[PDB]
Amino acid sequence: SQLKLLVTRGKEQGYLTYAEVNDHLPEDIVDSDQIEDIIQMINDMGIQVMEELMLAENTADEDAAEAAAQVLSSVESEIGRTTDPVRMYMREMGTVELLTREGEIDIAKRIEDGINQVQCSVAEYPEAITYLLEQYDRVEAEEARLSDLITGFVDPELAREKFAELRAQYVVTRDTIATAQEEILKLSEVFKQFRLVPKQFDYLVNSMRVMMDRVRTQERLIMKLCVEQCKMPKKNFITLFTGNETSDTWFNAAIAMNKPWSEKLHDVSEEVHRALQKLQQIEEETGLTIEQVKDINRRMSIGEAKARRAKKEMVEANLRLVISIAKKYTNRGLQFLDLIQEGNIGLMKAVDKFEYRRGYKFSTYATWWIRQAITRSIADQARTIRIPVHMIETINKLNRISRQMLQEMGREPTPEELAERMLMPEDKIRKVLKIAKEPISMETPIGDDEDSHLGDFIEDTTLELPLDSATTESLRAATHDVLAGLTAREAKVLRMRFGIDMNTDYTLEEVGKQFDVTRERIRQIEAKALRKLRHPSRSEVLRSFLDD
Amino acid sequence: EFDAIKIALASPDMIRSWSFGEVKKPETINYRTFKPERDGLFCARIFGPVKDYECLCGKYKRLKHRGVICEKCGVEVTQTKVRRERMGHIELASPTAHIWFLKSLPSRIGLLLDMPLRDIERVLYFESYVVIEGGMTNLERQQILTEEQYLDALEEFGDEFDAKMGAEAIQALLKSMDLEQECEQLREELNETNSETKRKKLTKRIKLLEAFVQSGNKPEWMILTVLPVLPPDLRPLVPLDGGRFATSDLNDLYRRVINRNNRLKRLLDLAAPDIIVRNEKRMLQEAVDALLDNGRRGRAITGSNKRPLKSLADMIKGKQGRFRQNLLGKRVDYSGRSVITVGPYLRLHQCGLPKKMALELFKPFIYGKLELRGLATTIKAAKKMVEREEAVVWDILDEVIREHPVLLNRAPTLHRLGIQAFEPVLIEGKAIQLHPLVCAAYNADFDGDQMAVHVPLTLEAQLEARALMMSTNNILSPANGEPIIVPSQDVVLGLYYMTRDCVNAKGEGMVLTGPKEAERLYRSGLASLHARVKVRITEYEKDANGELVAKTSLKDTTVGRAILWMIVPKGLPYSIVNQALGKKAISKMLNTCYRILGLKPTVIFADQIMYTGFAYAARSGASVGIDDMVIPEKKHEIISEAEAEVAEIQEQFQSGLVTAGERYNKVIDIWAAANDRVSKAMMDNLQTETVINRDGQEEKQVSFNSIYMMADSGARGSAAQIRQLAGMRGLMAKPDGSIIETPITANFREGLNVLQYFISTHGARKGLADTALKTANSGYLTRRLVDVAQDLVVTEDDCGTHEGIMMTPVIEGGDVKEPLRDRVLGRVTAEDVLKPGTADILVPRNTLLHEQWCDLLEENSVDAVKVRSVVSCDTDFGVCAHCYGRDLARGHIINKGEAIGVIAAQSIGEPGTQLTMRTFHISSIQVKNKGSIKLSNVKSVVNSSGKLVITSRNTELKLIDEFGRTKESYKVPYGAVLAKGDGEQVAGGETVANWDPHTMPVITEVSGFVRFTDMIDGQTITRQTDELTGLSSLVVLDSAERTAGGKDLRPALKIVDAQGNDVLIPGTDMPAQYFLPGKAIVQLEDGVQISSGDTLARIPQKDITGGLPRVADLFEARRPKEPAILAEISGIVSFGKETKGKRRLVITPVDGSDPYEEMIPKWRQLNVFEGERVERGDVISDGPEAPHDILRLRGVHAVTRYIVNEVQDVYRLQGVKINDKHIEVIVRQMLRKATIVNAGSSDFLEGEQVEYSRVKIANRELEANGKVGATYSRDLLGITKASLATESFISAASFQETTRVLTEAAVAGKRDELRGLKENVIVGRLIPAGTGYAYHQDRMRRRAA
Amino acid sequence: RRRKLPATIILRALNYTTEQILDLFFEKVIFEIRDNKLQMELVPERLRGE
Ligand SMILES: [Zn+2]
Ligand SMILES: [Zn+2]
């Protein structure tokens, strides 16, 4: 490469100027950032770069010299090597297709079917319909808000009768458990005309997920005990376990196999019988079989993944949209990529709330949600001392009525003038304009000789001066003296009543219990001692501690 | 309290154990009630309470609840100091590489996995994937894939293969990797394979693996899974005036990390589109790296006010960081500062301290003494009394002050005599009165300068100002024994005016009965201060064994010298005061007073000299007037002659006889000669012009011109400055050396018109600007030499070696420049040195050569003395007391615990302040005196002519008289025609040898016919036609223009007899033929005679740098560009393949590795023949010698002698004197590194650079054993690389790149046993150098009990 | 501060071909066959200091 001759040139001369670095660069290096990083490479190894008795020192090195030389030899071929976040993201966002010109409705139909598959999957579950009849009865028996179960449908009282009708249909479906299959299809087709509340639906889904997790955990307790500890064979356990799934022959008639592995599961025999009874018992706790609800939530997760794998595409396109929208606040005290990230999160938010039913184009509404979320995150995490969002709106309207009142009234706004033009009480506007200013950095370069900073002059208001600690130890010694000039009655009771040379100062009753006397005697004793201490010969030394 | 400082990585469990609680929200405080918001960056629940012993809500405020964790807000009731040590932790939901261990260059992450850097940073930012044990199918461990490669991998290779992305992948990679397995594979690849540099890098990686195993580090800790947040009171958010807070940038950086981490948690729990998740992980990584070291991966972010936010790495590193600016030098209590004035009434140990500046520095002592004496009841009454300045406080203060020294310190404390301890004297005013004699120590005048005062508080600290740092104990400069109590300018002129004489003054020639009567005559007004007179003075002499034998006599002196004699202490002679007493003589008088009478008599002599000088300078009334600059009346005719010659040259230039540059040079030469003429005229008019009458006619004496008296006494002035006042100003100079030809022919006494003044302002402003830098970059050399040579301490009274330096006078050119008494004074000899006839056992081995033994040495005229040096001392981690000699100032012998390294650096750097900041450049022997001839490399032949010719190469000839001492030294060429030859004692007026640079002879051994063998013209020789003599010449040339047929072949001149037999070279059976390289014209013919070394082949035909850069470069040990190659091995030489820039120079030893050969840059003038036996440690081509060359060839004493002589050349060029002990110490730190030639029984690597002291001790204890040690080879480094290698990472992080040092320490897991001066100062302990050295020895004895 | 292109590239960018460029920056020495093999057209001043 040519930069090799440049490094050896700098090492020959002992320096390297911006002219030679601009010459010897890879010609098509169009990236000023990697330019800066490669000059920082050639400098971070040493030689040092400049722009024009140069005897200071070398500073480095035989270890980092060949390191930076290796990095240079590699970077001579570093073609697509911007290597910064803001440009890497733009690359990987423009690289993806902008395949969105009213294909949004096709994506929406995909989501529509995928979200109805999860609907029918749950609605084929007996215990969930029991839960729904439960909540119809409770929500109409005043357990929650009267519409705390359903998001409308395709009316309090005819709806309650509708739900009684659904309850009758499902309870006869339960009554007629073959004969149960047709009645559960009745169940599914009769619930298929309804629509639940997404929060109740969410608990539904999470309960299905706990079903799945617990069934797979008992799967683990069955398998890992022998299929992972005794090394239970794979394909025979497959063709026997799944394929039977109910009877005692899968385990009880398999312990009688006497195979090289069936001579290994007599250990876990009673344990896998517990697992068998748990299988059949959880089938009760769900009402129907394990296989049924299992493939139910399986096809439901199929539909959910089908839905999610389209929100991905539209968030790709609309994230190009978000990088479009975000650029109006590049100087709002927030990073640009953080702006784009808040916009992306709001974009997912709007994608799950975008509707084709109004026939509205995607951009105008997703940009609504995106401007909302981006201004939200700006107001939230752009200032160290968080003022709430309404305070930011108030300071903004104050500023917007400030530029106006300046261009009109000539001179300047004022709290009198602003409380005039704005509807505030002339004093919270005071505190608002007190609040708006930013903390100056403690590393501000001060206008001094030593390159001093603002953090060097910030004094300390909590420290007690060593004249004020040696004016407390002197006081402790003085009080120990003046208390020594006293009976053990007064001395003990005063050290105890106050915190003198002791732990927590007790009240009168505690002092009395220590002295077996009632509180009024304690008060008389302490008053006696303070009287005795008030006169000189016991007061001159303490009093000099009072500069008042 | 605590032993060494251990360092390593931080386990995420260790970082969770440091923390007192997670930090989940980016909240600093509430905006109305400024209490910490949460559970945020400022939290009372994690980082302790925000007020002392006070819960946050207020439910718990009494001390009785001490320690409680309040039920409401869980804020542990405790001190608010607790808010300054508790740490938090942020829990990164995704891993995050430590930027220190990914950009450390070499990347520790990168070089551990052996995955190159760009691959790592390409898997990092999710640009690619990296397999991690991708099953038994296709791939390598660290095989990086592109995205689509991984996509197609998951198709054809579904599972049993796992490639991750991002920092998670690097974490899994480091985790799965097993260090001992790969280390074994590296063993196999290192010992089953031989590819030199590949195995160098291989073994470097191997050493890194073994270090990562030796330490407790695990490689998977280089990825931050858990991030600890600094305690809040280190990154505080403080209320300013106006409610606008002030925050350190670390709050910004912690907030940016915490928001991004919370958003990554959010997006992870939304199943977000994974490109957005990639962006969040990337941004969080960038945020953590801005937090750890901003501006280390990309561009600094940002800051909020358009300036790069500083991060923790910025908090440590940088000139304005934490290791440097409050760790090594900090602000200090009990200290003041004031304008210094003079106050000549002070004794040399005391200084005036203002009452107002003393009542503030001693307030603790005054409060204590008031409360003690009962004058004030308590500390508060005492404070009030001092606050109103009661009448008794001045007695209490005079009692506090009495024996309490204070440290006075000027701003640029270049040398250690810049912080001196004085006893204070409560003076009235607000200006410190500083004793005049000390101002040369401080380098301080009273043009407004200020000084800082400190109070040594404790007992042990205020006996060090009394015993070490006191003004009276320090009268000698540590850089050279000469007393720095030199009286400077009013004192030397008072003494010059006093101790002088006039040809006829009042009371001349009257016998006086002692100094007392002379003083009474002078005070009475009956006899002048300089009236020649006879006084009976009685002087003492203690050459007796301590006893002073007296002697009285009528000296013929003056009244001034008489009065001055009363001041001199007892045991000094009268000739010390019986001259005119300039400044040089005035400080020599003090040096003799010291070297006879110790310290206390000299200390009293100093202020006596000072008081009497000031007194008689004031008595003299020596003013200065405008008539005291008597311009010589011959100046006008000299300038007329100069203008005449210049006009002559201008006409000869207009005539076409000289170039323009030649006219410029001739004009400048004329004006320079005229300026020297006018200055000599003005000085001849000034110095002697006083003409007086003694008993008649007239007589001239030394002038009493006030300005001449200042110039001659040495108080102020020279000939140059008086010349500018009286003669002409001569030629100015533009800043770049361009001498102006229009010379200022005026002085300041007469006017300067506009043009001359404007001309002079050029050099004026250049000089001013140059000393505006030399003040700014004041002590950079002392800093660079206190970095390399800091931790040396005299730690042993004797190592007991026998190795030293053969110190002798620097007898160069003519008479010596530096005698033996200068350079052997104060050093202990290495071996018993006998007389030249040996006569006795003159000087024992370990006798400190003080003044008496130097007397002994230069009575016997001893010329060479072996004296122990510090670069040969056998001590470990230090220097023996005897291998350093006598210590200056204190002047007895260095006592163990001297920090000789700091002193050596300061003594090379304070004198260096007096040197030029720029680096500047500059037939028959005229042998001088009578003496004998001295031969080195004696191989000479007497021609038939009778004169001598050196048949050797480097024969050095010396003129050495009957003294035993060498008096002249000379380098003789290869066979000059010596009029005088070998051992021939001759006298002056007799040249020792004639020569000619157009004549370098190839003189032979024997006489005989010069046949021509191995000579065929057209291939090696050239046809030089004798148009000058009428013959033919075949001159020897190389293969430069002749073809390659016989190009390498040398033209052999066969010196044979008249019969035709090959006469041998007497000594070796190879006959007396010569193979000739070019540059030697041959005027012989084939079959022609020559006498005993007749002219066979004849070869036809002082700048010194001096700037302080010529000392930074002398010490930095670099390589010159004309590097004189030397003789690597003994034996004979062969020349081989030519015309390449490296002609083969083979060296066949006598009995060694005979095929030895090297390269020769054939642009060079090679100045040695091929038949002469090369001697090891000898030069071949002539040019500047390289230090590393000498160090590898002739020995450590060779390099030390070279470095010492070069630095002493540049120091003696400016007259600035510095001892050589200091440069030997800097060298001893310079060549601190050994290298392993043979591994041997030793246990270092093959070619490993190890600490020479380490290899020394190891192979020494093996030599005590039965096993062969390692054959080391001593390196030689520059100060800025000998300092780079330091044992303790604390000091190394102090003066180096901090991130590199702490990364290396963290990976290696170094343990810093604090045993250096620069480490202990940082950790607040006693330096193990001086007063605390006994303490550190007791600590080392307690440890390992 | 970009890379140092040669100095004739800008002369070419100004639509100067090589011939008038060399006519711009140089002088001219004339040779001709005046019956003896390209005689030189000598100038007095130009042969100074040679
Ligand atoms: Zn509380
Ligand atoms: Zn020693």
Side-chain angles (χ1 to χ4, degrees), chain A residues 55-56 91-92 338 342 441-442 545, chain B residues 127 247 249 260 263 278 286 380 784 1113:
Chain A
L55 306 141
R91 180 159 55 67
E92 308 220 340
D338 288 291
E342 309 288 342
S441 159
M442 200 137 48
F545 288 108
Chain B
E127 279 270 4
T247 83
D249 317 331
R260 288 179 174 175
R263 215 194 297 136
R278 282 185 201 171
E286 153 205 329
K380 287 266 296 310
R784 215 187 288 183
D1113 282 324

PDB file of all heavy atoms in Angstrom, chain A residues 55-56 91-92 338 342 441-442 545, chain B residues 127 247 249 260 263 278 286 380 784 1113:
ATOM      1  N   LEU A  55      12.614  18.520  19.521  1.00  0.00           N
ATOM      2  CA  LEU A  55      13.124  17.458  20.385  1.00  0.00           C
ATOM      3  C   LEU A  55      12.356  17.446  21.705  1.00  0.00           C
ATOM      4  O   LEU A  55      12.751  18.056  22.699  1.00  0.00           O
ATOM      5  CB  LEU A  55      14.615  17.649  20.612  1.00  0.00           C
ATOM      6  CG  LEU A  55      15.380  17.746  19.292  1.00  0.00           C
ATOM      7  CD1 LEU A  55      16.490  18.780  19.376  1.00  0.00           C
ATOM      8  CD2 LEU A  55      15.918  16.399  18.850  1.00  0.00           C
ATOM      9  N   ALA A  56      11.209  16.766  21.695  1.00  0.00           N
ATOM     10  CA  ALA A  56      10.491  16.527  22.941  1.00  0.00           C
ATOM     11  C   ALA A  56      10.631  15.088  23.431  1.00  0.00           C
ATOM     12  O   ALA A  56      11.329  14.840  24.417  1.00  0.00           O
ATOM     13  CB  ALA A  56       9.012  16.890  22.766  1.00  0.00           C
ATOM     14  N   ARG A  91     -27.341   3.541   6.606  1.00  0.00           N
ATOM     15  CA  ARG A  91     -27.029   2.496   5.640  1.00  0.00           C
ATOM     16  C   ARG A  91     -28.018   1.341   5.740  1.00  0.00           C
ATOM     17  O   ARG A  91     -28.666   0.972   4.754  1.00  0.00           O
ATOM     18  CB  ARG A  91     -25.598   2.009   5.866  1.00  0.00           C
ATOM     19  CG  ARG A  91     -25.138   0.917   4.931  1.00  0.00           C
ATOM     20  CD  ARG A  91     -23.628   0.867   4.881  1.00  0.00           C
ATOM     21  NE  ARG A  91     -23.048   0.722   6.211  1.00  0.00           N
ATOM     22  CZ  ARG A  91     -23.188  -0.357   6.974  1.00  0.00           C
ATOM     23  NH1 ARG A  91     -23.882  -1.399   6.541  1.00  0.00           N
ATOM     24  NH2 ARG A  91     -22.626  -0.399   8.174  1.00  0.00           N
ATOM     25  N   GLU A  92     -28.168   0.773   6.936  1.00  0.00           N
ATOM     26  CA  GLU A  92     -29.003  -0.414   7.083  1.00  0.00           C
ATOM     27  C   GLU A  92     -30.492  -0.091   7.081  1.00  0.00           C
ATOM     28  O   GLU A  92     -31.312  -1.013   7.137  1.00  0.00           O
ATOM     29  CB  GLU A  92     -28.620  -1.163   8.357  1.00  0.00           C
ATOM     30  CG  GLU A  92     -27.131  -1.443   8.452  1.00  0.00           C
ATOM     31  CD  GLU A  92     -26.814  -2.815   9.013  1.00  0.00           C
ATOM     32  OE1 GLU A  92     -27.686  -3.411   9.674  1.00  0.00           O
ATOM     33  OE2 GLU A  92     -25.686  -3.295   8.792  1.00  0.00           O
ATOM     34  N   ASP A 338     -31.056   9.059  19.501  1.00  0.00           N
ATOM     35  CA  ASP A 338     -32.064   8.860  20.533  1.00  0.00           C
ATOM     36  C   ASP A 338     -33.419   9.380  20.068  1.00  0.00           C
ATOM     37  O   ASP A 338     -34.459   8.771  20.345  1.00  0.00           O
ATOM     38  CB  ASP A 338     -31.626   9.547  21.823  1.00  0.00           C
ATOM     39  CG  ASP A 338     -30.478   8.824  22.507  1.00  0.00           C
ATOM     40  OD1 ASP A 338     -30.697   7.708  23.021  1.00  0.00           O
ATOM     41  OD2 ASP A 338     -29.358   9.374  22.546  1.00  0.00           O
ATOM     42  N   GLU A 342     -36.738   6.997  19.802  1.00  0.00           N
ATOM     43  CA  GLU A 342     -38.059   7.312  20.327  1.00  0.00           C
ATOM     44  C   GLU A 342     -39.090   7.328  19.208  1.00  0.00           C
ATOM     45  O   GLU A 342     -40.225   6.865  19.385  1.00  0.00           O
ATOM     46  CB  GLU A 342     -38.024   8.653  21.048  1.00  0.00           C
ATOM     47  CG  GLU A 342     -36.923   8.760  22.074  1.00  0.00           C
ATOM     48  CD  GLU A 342     -37.191   7.916  23.296  1.00  0.00           C
ATOM     49  OE1 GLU A 342     -38.360   7.521  23.494  1.00  0.00           O
ATOM     50  OE2 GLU A 342     -36.241   7.655  24.062  1.00  0.00           O
ATOM     51  N   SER A 441     -21.820  23.515  33.253  1.00  0.00           N
ATOM     52  CA  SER A 441     -20.926  22.387  33.484  1.00  0.00           C
ATOM     53  C   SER A 441     -19.896  22.771  34.530  1.00  0.00           C
ATOM     54  O   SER A 441     -19.407  23.903  34.544  1.00  0.00           O
ATOM     55  CB  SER A 441     -20.248  21.968  32.185  1.00  0.00           C
ATOM     56  OG  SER A 441     -19.068  21.231  32.446  1.00  0.00           O
ATOM     57  N   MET A 442     -19.571  21.835  35.419  1.00  0.00           N
ATOM     58  CA  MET A 442     -18.565  22.103  36.431  1.00  0.00           C
ATOM     59  C   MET A 442     -17.154  22.074  35.872  1.00  0.00           C
ATOM     60  O   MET A 442     -16.216  22.407  36.600  1.00  0.00           O
ATOM     61  CB  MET A 442     -18.686  21.105  37.580  1.00  0.00           C
ATOM     62  CG  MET A 442     -18.035  21.581  38.860  1.00  0.00           C
ATOM     63  SD  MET A 442     -19.002  21.277  40.352  1.00  0.00           S
ATOM     64  CE  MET A 442     -19.438  19.561  40.121  1.00  0.00           C
ATOM     65  N   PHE A 545     -17.923  29.990  76.315  1.00  0.00           N
ATOM     66  CA  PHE A 545     -18.334  29.318  75.093  1.00  0.00           C
ATOM     67  C   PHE A 545     -19.515  29.995  74.419  1.00  0.00           C
ATOM     68  O   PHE A 545     -19.887  29.598  73.311  1.00  0.00           O
ATOM     69  CB  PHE A 545     -18.690  27.868  75.395  1.00  0.00           C
ATOM     70  CG  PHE A 545     -17.510  27.014  75.694  1.00  0.00           C
ATOM     71  CD1 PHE A 545     -17.267  26.578  76.978  1.00  0.00           C
ATOM     72  CD2 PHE A 545     -16.640  26.650  74.690  1.00  0.00           C
ATOM     73  CE1 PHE A 545     -16.179  25.790  77.256  1.00  0.00           C
ATOM     74  CE2 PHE A 545     -15.552  25.864  74.961  1.00  0.00           C
ATOM     75  CZ  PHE A 545     -15.319  25.432  76.245  1.00  0.00           C
TER      76      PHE A 545
ATOM     77  N   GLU B 127     -22.257  -5.694  12.237  1.00  0.00           N
ATOM     78  CA  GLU B 127     -21.963  -5.728  10.814  1.00  0.00           C
ATOM     79  C   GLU B 127     -21.887  -7.144  10.275  1.00  0.00           C
ATOM     80  O   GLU B 127     -22.079  -7.347   9.074  1.00  0.00           O
ATOM     81  CB  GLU B 127     -20.643  -5.014  10.532  1.00  0.00           C
ATOM     82  CG  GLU B 127     -20.741  -3.515  10.470  1.00  0.00           C
ATOM     83  CD  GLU B 127     -21.043  -3.029   9.073  1.00  0.00           C
ATOM     84  OE1 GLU B 127     -21.256  -3.882   8.183  1.00  0.00           O
ATOM     85  OE2 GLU B 127     -21.066  -1.800   8.860  1.00  0.00           O
ATOM     86  N   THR B 247     -23.109  21.119  37.452  1.00  0.00           N
ATOM     87  CA  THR B 247     -22.978  19.673  37.433  1.00  0.00           C
ATOM     88  C   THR B 247     -21.703  19.297  36.708  1.00  0.00           C
ATOM     89  O   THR B 247     -21.276  19.977  35.775  1.00  0.00           O
ATOM     90  CB  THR B 247     -24.158  19.007  36.726  1.00  0.00           C
ATOM     91  OG1 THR B 247     -23.932  19.034  35.313  1.00  0.00           O
ATOM     92  CG2 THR B 247     -25.429  19.748  37.020  1.00  0.00           C
ATOM     93  N   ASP B 249     -19.840  16.645  34.159  1.00  0.00           N
ATOM     94  CA  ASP B 249     -20.358  15.999  32.959  1.00  0.00           C
ATOM     95  C   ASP B 249     -20.678  14.529  33.170  1.00  0.00           C
ATOM     96  O   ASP B 249     -21.453  13.958  32.394  1.00  0.00           O
ATOM     97  CB  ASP B 249     -19.359  16.139  31.825  1.00  0.00           C
ATOM     98  CG  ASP B 249     -18.772  17.520  31.746  1.00  0.00           C
ATOM     99  OD1 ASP B 249     -19.459  18.478  32.151  1.00  0.00           O
ATOM    100  OD2 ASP B 249     -17.625  17.651  31.277  1.00  0.00           O
ATOM    101  N   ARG B 260     -30.592   5.043  27.569  1.00  0.00           N
ATOM    102  CA  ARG B 260     -30.437   4.068  26.505  1.00  0.00           C
ATOM    103  C   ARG B 260     -30.579   2.652  27.027  1.00  0.00           C
ATOM    104  O   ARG B 260     -31.141   1.796  26.339  1.00  0.00           O
ATOM    105  CB  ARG B 260     -29.103   4.290  25.814  1.00  0.00           C
ATOM    106  CG  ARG B 260     -29.148   5.538  24.976  1.00  0.00           C
ATOM    107  CD  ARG B 260     -27.843   5.827  24.295  1.00  0.00           C
ATOM    108  NE  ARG B 260     -27.982   6.962  23.392  1.00  0.00           N
ATOM    109  CZ  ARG B 260     -26.979   7.508  22.721  1.00  0.00           C
ATOM    110  NH1 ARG B 260     -25.756   7.026  22.850  1.00  0.00           N
ATOM    111  NH2 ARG B 260     -27.202   8.537  21.923  1.00  0.00           N
ATOM    112  N   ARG B 263     -34.258   2.067  27.502  1.00  0.00           N
ATOM    113  CA  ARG B 263     -34.929   1.923  26.218  1.00  0.00           C
ATOM    114  C   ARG B 263     -34.621   0.574  25.589  1.00  0.00           C
ATOM    115  O   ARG B 263     -35.472  -0.011  24.915  1.00  0.00           O
ATOM    116  CB  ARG B 263     -34.525   3.056  25.283  1.00  0.00           C
ATOM    117  CG  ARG B 263     -35.626   3.510  24.376  1.00  0.00           C
ATOM    118  CD  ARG B 263     -35.060   4.358  23.275  1.00  0.00           C
ATOM    119  NE  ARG B 263     -34.434   5.572  23.782  1.00  0.00           N
ATOM    120  CZ  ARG B 263     -33.266   6.033  23.359  1.00  0.00           C
ATOM    121  NH1 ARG B 263     -32.589   5.368  22.437  1.00  0.00           N
ATOM    122  NH2 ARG B 263     -32.772   7.147  23.870  1.00  0.00           N
ATOM    123  N   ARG B 278     -30.950  -3.520  17.077  1.00  0.00           N
ATOM    124  CA  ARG B 278     -29.537  -3.367  16.761  1.00  0.00           C
ATOM    125  C   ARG B 278     -29.084  -1.934  16.988  1.00  0.00           C
ATOM    126  O   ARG B 278     -28.016  -1.692  17.557  1.00  0.00           O
ATOM    127  CB  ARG B 278     -29.269  -3.755  15.312  1.00  0.00           C
ATOM    128  CG  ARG B 278     -29.206  -5.224  14.993  1.00  0.00           C
ATOM    129  CD  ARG B 278     -28.803  -5.327  13.540  1.00  0.00           C
ATOM    130  NE  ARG B 278     -29.143  -6.595  12.918  1.00  0.00           N
ATOM    131  CZ  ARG B 278     -29.029  -6.817  11.615  1.00  0.00           C
ATOM    132  NH1 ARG B 278     -28.591  -5.852  10.820  1.00  0.00           N
ATOM    133  NH2 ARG B 278     -29.355  -7.996  11.104  1.00  0.00           N
ATOM    134  N   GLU B 286     -21.982   2.807  22.307  1.00  0.00           N
ATOM    135  CA  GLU B 286     -21.294   4.082  22.128  1.00  0.00           C
ATOM    136  C   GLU B 286     -21.405   4.941  23.374  1.00  0.00           C
ATOM    137  O   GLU B 286     -20.471   5.666  23.724  1.00  0.00           O
ATOM    138  CB  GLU B 286     -21.865   4.845  20.941  1.00  0.00           C
ATOM    139  CG  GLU B 286     -21.675   6.346  21.094  1.00  0.00           C
ATOM    140  CD  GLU B 286     -22.689   7.166  20.321  1.00  0.00           C
ATOM    141  OE1 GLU B 286     -23.151   6.700  19.262  1.00  0.00           O
ATOM    142  OE2 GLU B 286     -23.033   8.276  20.783  1.00  0.00           O
ATOM    143  N   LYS B 380     -12.434  30.027  72.385  1.00  0.00           N
ATOM    144  CA  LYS B 380     -13.246  31.104  71.831  1.00  0.00           C
ATOM    145  C   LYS B 380     -12.772  32.459  72.329  1.00  0.00           C
ATOM    146  O   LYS B 380     -12.690  33.418  71.555  1.00  0.00           O
ATOM    147  CB  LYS B 380     -14.711  30.889  72.185  1.00  0.00           C
ATOM    148  CG  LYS B 380     -15.360  29.775  71.406  1.00  0.00           C
ATOM    149  CD  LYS B 380     -16.042  30.310  70.176  1.00  0.00           C
ATOM    150  CE  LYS B 380     -17.178  31.227  70.561  1.00  0.00           C
ATOM    151  NZ  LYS B 380     -18.052  30.585  71.571  1.00  0.00           N
ATOM    152  N   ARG B 784      12.211  15.914  32.979  1.00  0.00           N
ATOM    153  CA  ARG B 784      12.486  14.701  32.223  1.00  0.00           C
ATOM    154  C   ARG B 784      13.543  13.840  32.894  1.00  0.00           C
ATOM    155  O   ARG B 784      13.599  12.634  32.652  1.00  0.00           O
ATOM    156  CB  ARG B 784      12.928  15.074  30.817  1.00  0.00           C
ATOM    157  CG  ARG B 784      12.475  14.109  29.768  1.00  0.00           C
ATOM    158  CD  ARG B 784      13.077  14.444  28.421  1.00  0.00           C
ATOM    159  NE  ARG B 784      12.501  15.639  27.824  1.00  0.00           N
ATOM    160  CZ  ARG B 784      12.842  16.090  26.627  1.00  0.00           C
ATOM    161  NH1 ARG B 784      13.741  15.430  25.911  1.00  0.00           N
ATOM    162  NH2 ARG B 784      12.282  17.184  26.137  1.00  0.00           N
ATOM    163  N   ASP B1113      19.411  16.043  23.792  1.00  0.00           N
ATOM    164  CA  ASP B1113      19.761  15.031  22.803  1.00  0.00           C
ATOM    165  C   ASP B1113      20.930  14.178  23.258  1.00  0.00           C
ATOM    166  O   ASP B1113      21.030  13.006  22.883  1.00  0.00           O
ATOM    167  CB  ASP B1113      20.099  15.690  21.477  1.00  0.00           C
ATOM    168  CG  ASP B1113      18.879  16.105  20.722  1.00  0.00           C
ATOM    169  OD1 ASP B1113      17.875  15.370  20.792  1.00  0.00           O
ATOM    170  OD2 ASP B1113      18.928  17.159  20.056  1.00  0.00           O
TER     171      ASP B1113
END
